[PDB]
Every structure is written in C-alpha cells, then in structure tokens.
C-alpha cells in the first residue's frame, strides 16, 4: 500500500496477552499512531504496514 488515509483501520495487538483488535475494536491510523504510543504494550497489527519510506 501507499497513499493511506487517516480514516484507515489498522489492527492493534497487546503483546501483554497476544491480544488483538480489529474492526471497531481497531483505531484508524491517526488514532493508532496516537493510541500505539498511549499503550507501549500493543504494538502493530497488521500483514503487511507501509510506512511509505523506509527509515
């Protein structure tokens, strides 16, 4: 993927308890990025993830 928008649902996982979240129970990227950082415990969830440039 590439040009994502901030609507986007993207998957969270609670390494605490291999926990998953999807759907309604997802954040959209914005919130993600936001809500990721709010809990060190989840880390990203998804098959893929693009962050469009490599760092």
């Not at 809500?35 to 880390?43: E, F, M, N, R, V």
């Amino acid at each position: 993927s590439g040009q994502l928008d901030p609507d986007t649902r993207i998957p969270v996982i609670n390494l605490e308890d291999g926990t998953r979240l999807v759907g309604e129970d997802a954040p959209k990227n914005k919130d993600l990025v936001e809500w990721l950082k709010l809990h060190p415990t989840y880390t990203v969830d998804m098959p893929s993830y693009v962050p469009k440039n490599a760092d």
